[PDB]
C-alpha cells in the first residue's frame, strides 16, 4: 500500500510549499490523480485477497471504502474552500494538512492486517477530527462537541485494546490472515461475555448504537462541512470494519447474546426516524437519519448472514455518499441564509431550480428508490432480517413508512411553498457548488449499473 | 423525554456530577501541616494494624 | 455569522481560584502575579 | 544567587543522585539522600519569598520523616540480616518502613499532601528540578529491592495515586498544581508495573521526564504561571500554541503520540500476568487525566482568548530567553511511537 | 530482566558479542525516520526563534540531522544486540530443559472433534 | 530478640507519634525528630556492640553527624519564618492553599 | 547574545565600570517647565547623554528602521483626541497613559542597561517613579474610574519592586499661571484645552505624596523656574552633593549582575505589563487582535527577527 | 431563534427529576424494549424447537 | 481486615442469615471508621462532640449499608434458591443504594447508587465464580 | 465603558458584483477559470468516464464468469456418466475417522 | 542599513558555523569509519567472505 501512502505523504509538502493563491487548485488536482490511481486496488480474486505485504492487505470489503475515502477528500476540499477565504494562509494550510493527515490515517486504518495496528491508527484518526471540530466550527457548542465526541469513543475502546492485547497473549498473533485459520470457538461464560462486551462496545459507540448516539447530533450542527462530510460518510464506517474484522473471533457466543443490541437498534431506529419527523434543523435531521441507517447496519452485521453482509456493505457506501451530499445541500442553504432553521427559507424552487433538482435527487436516493444501491443494500438487509425472524418485518415496515415521510417533508418545506418575502440574498448557482453536487451524485447513480464491486467480501 | 433528558442523564451527566463532587471533596484542603501529618499517622496505623501488610 | 470567540464572561469563568467554587473556597483569593507576598526598652537605672 | 555557588549546589545534588545510583551500601544510600535534600533546599529559596519558605518547611519536614523511616528500615534489615548489601530485604516490616519512606519521598498518595504546595510555592525551574530529578533516586532504590516489595501494598498505593491525582487535577486552575497532580498520576502508572517488569517502569519514567521537562520548558519560555496568561500566549506567538497543543495532547495518552507508547505497553506487561480489571481502572483514570488536559488545551490553543493592548509592545522584541534543547525534547515527546522497540536498550 | 546478563560486566554499551552481529545498514528505514526527526527539530528551531523556516541556518539543520542519525544508529545497534541476546537465551534454555517442555503431535482434521453452531 | 531493643524501638515510635501529631510549634517537632534520631543511633550502636562488628562502628556517629547536618538546617528554616511571621506557629503556616 | 552568568564567572564586574561620573539623573516637573533642554543641558557638559522623553512611539524608534509606527500597529491611542475630549467612552486616555507607562519602563530599562554596561551616567526625563501623579490628575477630573486605577497600581506594584531609584532627581517649580500662559503661547491648536484643575492637581499630588517618598530613596533638588534657565548653578549643585541616600551603596556585584540579567531581556521587563486583569478600556477583540497581528507581520522588517529579513537587504541568512 | 433555542437547548437546564418525569421516562424507555425482547425471544425458541425436530418445512430454503 | 472478607466468604451464600449480615456489618463498620478517621484528619471538626458525631454518623451509615446488603443477599438467595446467581447481589446492591439514599436524604443518589454498587456486587460475584484476581501475582 | 473593543462583524461578501463571471472559487478571474478547468477536466473527463471504462472491462471480477465455465464443464461430465449433480457430502465420506458413540 | 542598531545575529559569525561544519564532518567521518570497522569485523568474526 506504499503506492498510495507515499503520494499522500508527498502531497503533504505540496500543500506546504504551494503559493498563496494556488493551494486549492494544486491540492484538488493531485488528490484527483490519487483518486484515479486508487482504482488499481480492484485486482480481486474469488478466493484470495490482494495481500500486498506483511502488514498491508485489502480484500473485496475494504477496497470500496478506500476508493470512497480518497474520492471524498477532493469533495471536502471543494466544500470547505469558501468560508476559509478570509482565514489566514498558514491556518488554511493547517486545515488542508489536517484533512490530508485524516485521509492518510483512514487509508492506513482499512488496510491494517494486524488488529493492533488497526486500533492504533483507528484512533489516531481521533486527533484531526477533534481539532477540526473544535477549531473551525461556528458556534459555542463546538467546545461541548469536542467532549461528547471524544469521551464517548475512547471510553468504548480503552477496554477493547486490553481485550486485543489479551488475544495477543492467547492466540499468539492478532494478524487477520492467521486468525482465519487459528480461530477457536468461544464458550459460554461470564469472562467470554465481558470479552464480547469489550470487543463490541467501541464500535457500538462508533456506529453509534441507540442510547450511545448523543455524540452524533451535537457534533454535526456546528462543524465545518469538511468535518461534517468526513464524520457522516467515512468516519462512521470504522464501526462496520470493526464488525467485519472482529466478529470472526466472537463465535458462537454472538448468536445468543446480541438480542438486546438488536432490540435497542431496531426500536432506536424507529425512535430516531420519529425524531426526524419532528426536527427544526437540517443538520440534526440528517444526523438522526444517519443514526437510523447505522442502527440498520448494526442489525445487519449482528445477524451475520451472507445476504446481510452484502446489504450492510452496500447500505454503508450508499448512505455515506447520500449523507455527504445531503450535508452539502444543508451547507449551501446555510451559506445563503446564514441560519439552520428549516422553516425560515422556504419555496426555493421558485428561485433556485438546479438546487431543487439536486434536492429531489437527494430525497429520492435517501428513501431507497430502486434500482439505486441504497435500495439494494436496504432490501438485502430487509430479507436477512426477515430470515432471522418473521415479526422483524413489522418493526421494519413502519420505519420504511417513516423514512419516506420525513425524507420528502425535509425537501418540501425547504423547496415548495410561498417563498419568504424578507429574504433577498439568494444568489444563483455557483459553478463550484453544482460541480461538487454532481460529483457527489453521478457515482451514486453509476454504481447501480455495476453493483458487484461494492457487494462485500463474499459476493 | 428520552433523547434529550434521560439518555443524556444516565450515562454522561451522572458521571460528570459524580466526578464534580469527588474532585470538590478531594481538593478542599486547608493547607495545615498538622492535619497532613495526622493523616500520615492514621494512614500508617491503618496499613500496619487493619490491613496487616507484614504477613 | 462568523466564528464565535470567547468573551470576558468565559475568561472570568476560567479566572477563579478553583475550577468549581464550592462552599469553602469562597474567600480563596488568587495568588499574586509577581509571586511576591518591638525593640527592647531597657532602663539603665540609678542603682 | 551567586553563579559559582549555584553551580556548586547543582553539582552537589547531581553528586547525591549519583551516589544513590552507584553505591552498594545502605549508609551511602542514606548519605546520598541527605545530600540530595540539603542541595535541593536552597534551590527553592532562590527568590526569598514567604511562599518559598512555607514550601521549603513542608518539603524539609516530609523528607526528614521519610529519611528517619528509611533509617529505621535499614537498621531493622541490619539487625535481622547482619550486612549492608543493597539487595532483597530480610524482613516484611523493614520492607513496610522502606516502602513508606520511598512513597513519602516520591509524593505517592496518600502521602501526596506535600507535592502541590511545594510545586506552587517555588519557581518554574525549581519545579522542573524537583519533579524531574527527585524521581530518579527513589526509583533506583525501588528497582534494587523489588524482590522484597509486598504486592498488595504497592498496587494499592499505585491505584490510590492515579485516582487521587486525577481527582485533584480536575479542580485546579494554577498550572503548578496541575503539574503536581499529573505527576502523581504518572507516578501511579509507573509504579503499578514495577513488580511485573521494571523495564516498563524505567521506560515510563524516561518518557514522563521528557514530557514534563518539555512542558516546564514551554512554561519557562512563555513566562506563564496561570491559565489566563497561557490563553493570552496566542497573540504573542502561534507556534507556542501549536507546541503546547501537541505536547498536552501527547501527555493525554492519544495515538500516534509518544505518550501512548509507555502506558499501552504497561497493559502489555499486565495482561501477561492475567491482571485485567486493574489496567482497565487505570485507563479510566487516565481518561480523567485526559479530561483535565483537554480542558487546559481548550483554554490555551483551540480557542483564542481576548488580549490586551500592551502586548503590541511585546511584538517588537523577539524571545531572547534560552530554551534548553526545546525542539529535541518536543520531538521526543511527540513522535516517538514508530521507534517503540527502542525500550530494549533499557534491559 | 536481562540484568543477570548485565551482571558480571557492567556499563557496557556494546559488549564483545555485539561486534559479531550484522550492523544496521545506512539505508535502514528507522535511521531515515530518525533523520526526519532531526530535520523536524531543525525546522522547529527555525520556527520558534522567528526565523525563516526552510533556509535559515543550514549548519544547524545539518548538525541536528547528523547528531540524530549518530545516536539513532548506536541505539539501534544496542536494540538489535539486546533482541539477539533475548533469542539466544531463549534457544539456550529451550535446549537445556526438554523435560518441562515436551513435543506435540499435531492431529489431522479427519478425527479431531469440533462442534458446529448453526447461524440462522 | 531482647528487652532493651524493645524499649528503644518503642521510644522511637513514641517520638514518631509525637512528631506526627503537632502541637502548634515547629521547633518542638524538630526536637521530636532529633529524639527519633537518638533512638535510631542508640539502636544501631547497641546492635553493633552486641554483634562485635568493629568495622561498621563508623556508621552510628556518622549517622549522628549527618543528622546535625540537617538539624541546623531546620533551625535555619525557623528564623526565616520568624523573619516573616512574628512567631513560629504551624497554624499560621497555611498561606499555600490557593 | 552578549552577557550572561558565564561573563560574571569570567570576571565582568559592573562596579569596576561605575566611577564618580556614573550618576543616574532624571528631570521631571510640570507640562511646560522648560526642562526640555535642561536635562539635555546636563547631557552636553557632564560627559553624559540624554534620551528624549518616552513618547507614544519611542519603541517604534528604538527598534526597526527607527521610523515611528502608525497608530494601529503601536498604541491604538491618541494624545490629541485625549486633549480634545478626555471623557470619551472608549477610554482612550487610559490607553494612552498605559502606553506611555510601558514606554517609560522600556526607556528606564535601556538607561539602566547603558549604565550597567558602560559605566556612564544617563540623563532621563520623567522616570517611572514620577508617572503615576499624572494618573492622579486623571482621577481628579473624573476622567477614569476606580478599577483602572486599581489595575495601574497592580501593574506598578508588580513591575517596580525589582528596580532602583536614580541618583539625583531635578524638579523645576513653575506656577500654574505662568505655565498656562506658556501653553497659550505654544501655538499648537491641539493643546488649547488644558484645564487649570489639571495642573493644580498635578502640583498638589506632586508636592503632597511624591516628595515625602522620593526624598529618602534618592536626592531631590527643588529648583525654580527663573533659575532653571541658570545651568551653572544646577551643575554646581550636581557636582557638590553627597551620595549617601538611597539603596545605591548596598549593591554589590552579584545584585547588579542579577539586575543586568533581568534588564537586558526586554520581555522579562514587559512580562507583567499585560497582566490578565480584564478591563473594558484595555481589552482588544480577538478578531481585531488577529487582524492587527497579521498586519504587523507584513510590515517590512517585522516578519522575522532583526537580522533575518530578505526584504530589507540582509545577506548570508542561509549561513545565519 | 428564541423558539429554536427553547426547543432543544433549554430542556435539560430547567429539568428536575421527580416522580412524573422519571415514571414517564421509565415507562417509555424500557417498556417497549422489554416487550419486543420477549416477543422476539419466544419466537426464537419456537422457531428453534420447530427446526431441530424437522417439523419446519425447509425444502427449498438454501438462500439465507 | 484480611480475616473479615475471608470470614464473609467462608460461609456458603444464602444458607445462614445473621452471621453473614453481621460479617457484612463489621466490614462496613471498619470502612466507616477508616473514612471517618480520614474525614476528621483532613477536615478539622469544630469540636470534639461534633467530631465524634460525624464519626458515629459515618459508622452508622456504613454499618446500615453493609447490614442491608448482606440481609438482602441472604433472603434473595434463599427465596430464589440459587447460590451461584449474581442477580441476588444486584438486588442487594440496589437495597444498599436505597439505604444510602435514605440516610443521605436523596432519591437520584439512591437510584445511581442502586445501579453502581449493584454492578459492583455483580462484578464481585462473577469475580468469585470465575476466579478473577484484583492483585495478580507475578508469573512472567 | 464598552467591553472588549472589537471590530464590527463583517457583512456577507457577495461575489457577483465585482465579478459577474465568477464560478465561486476566488476573486481573481484567471484563478477561477483555471480552478474550474482543473476540476472539470480531472474530475469528470478523467476519473468518471475512464473509471467507468476501467470497471466495465475489468478482467473477470472474482473469476465469476470462470465460475460459469468450469461449472459448464462439470455437469457436462456428470450428466454423461449417470453421476448425481451434487452430493450431500462435501468431502469424501470414506476419508474421515468418525468419533466414537 | 535598515535597523537603527546592529543586531547580534545580523552578522555571520564564521567561527561558530565553521565549528558546526567541522563537528558535522567529524561525526559523519567517524560514522562511516565505524560502520566499515563493524562490517569487516563481522565478516572476520564469521568467515562469510
Ligand atoms: C462507553 C462506556 C462503557 C464501556 C463498556 C465496555 C464493555 C464493558 C466491559 C469492559 C471490561 C474491561 C475489559 C475486559 C477485557 C477482558 C478480556 C478477557 O479475556 O477477559 C477474560 C478475563 C477472565 O480472567 P482471566 O482470563 O485472567 O482468567 C483465566 C481464565 N479463567 C477464568 C478460566 C481462570 O476476565 C477478567 O479478568 C474480568 C473481565 C471483566 C472486567 C470487569 C471490570 C471492568 C468493568 C467495565 C468498565 C468499563 C469502563 C467504565 C468507565 C468508562 C469511562 C467513564
Ligand atoms: C466504488 C466505491 C466508492 C464509491 C465512490 C467511487 C468514486 C470513483 C468513481 C469512479 C467512476 C465511476 C466508477 C463506477 C462506474 C459504474 C458504471 C459502469 O462503468 O458500469 C459498467 C457496466 C458494464 O456492463 P456489464 O457489466 O454488463 O458488461 C460486462 C463486461 N463486458 C463488456 C466485458 C462483457 O456498464 C453498463 O452496464 C453500461 C450499460 C450501457 C449504458 C446504459 C444504457 C441505458 C441508459 C439508460 C436508458 C434509459 C433507461 C430508462 C430510464 C427511465 C427513467 C429513470
Ligand atoms: N502620563 C501622562 N499623562 C498625561 N499626559 C502626559 C503623560 N506623560 C506625558 N504627558 C504629556 O507629555 C508632554 C510632555 O512634553 P514636554 O511638554 O516636552 O514636557 C506634556 O504635554 C504632558 O502633559
Coordinates of N, CA, C and O and ligand atoms in Angstrom, one line a residue, chain G residues 31 35-36 53 83 100 104 126 131 134 198, ligand 3:
Chain G
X31 N 4.0 70.5 32.9 CA 3.8 70.2 31.5 C 4.9 70.9 30.6 O 5.6 70.3 29.8
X35 N 12.2 72.2 31.1 CA 13.2 71.3 31.4 C 13.6 70.5 30.1 O 14.6 69.7 30.2
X36 N 12.9 70.7 29.0 CA 13.1 70.0 27.8 C 14.5 70.2 27.2 O 14.9 69.3 26.4
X53 N 12.1 62.2 26.1 CA 11.1 61.6 27.0 C 10.3 60.5 26.3 O 10.1 60.6 25.0
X83 N -6.8 65.1 24.3 CA -6.8 66.5 24.7 C -8.1 67.2 24.3 O -8.5 68.1 25.0
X100 N 2.2 55.1 27.4 CA 3.3 55.9 27.9 C 4.0 55.3 29.1 O 5.2 55.4 29.2
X104 N 7.9 54.3 29.3 CA 8.8 54.7 30.3 C 9.5 53.5 30.9 O 10.7 53.7 31.3
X126 N 11.3 62.4 33.3 CA 10.0 61.9 33.9 C 10.1 60.3 34.0 O 9.4 59.6 33.3
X131 N 5.4 59.0 37.1 CA 4.3 59.0 36.1 C 2.9 58.9 36.7 O 2.0 59.5 36.2
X134 N 0.5 61.9 37.1 CA -0.4 62.2 36.0 C -1.7 61.5 36.1 O -2.8 62.1 36.0
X198 N -6.4 70.5 36.1 CA -5.4 69.5 35.7 C -4.0 69.9 36.3 O -3.4 69.0 37.0
Ligands
LIG3 N1 1.1 60.0 31.8 C1 0.8 61.2 31.2 N2 -0.5 61.6 31.2 C2 -0.9 62.7 30.6 N3 0.0 63.5 29.9 C3 1.3 63.2 29.8 C4 1.8 62.0 30.5 N4 3.1 61.9 30.2 C5 3.4 63.0 29.5 N5 2.4 63.7 29.2 C6 2.4 65.0 28.4 O1 3.6 65.0 27.6 C7 4.0 66.3 27.5 C8 5.5 66.4 27.9 O2 6.3 67.0 27.0 P1 7.0 68.4 27.3 O3 5.9 69.4 27.0 O4 8.1 68.5 26.2 O5 7.5 68.3 28.7 C9 3.1 67.2 28.3 O6 2.1 67.7 27.4 C10 2.4 66.2 29.2 O7 1.2 66.6 29.7

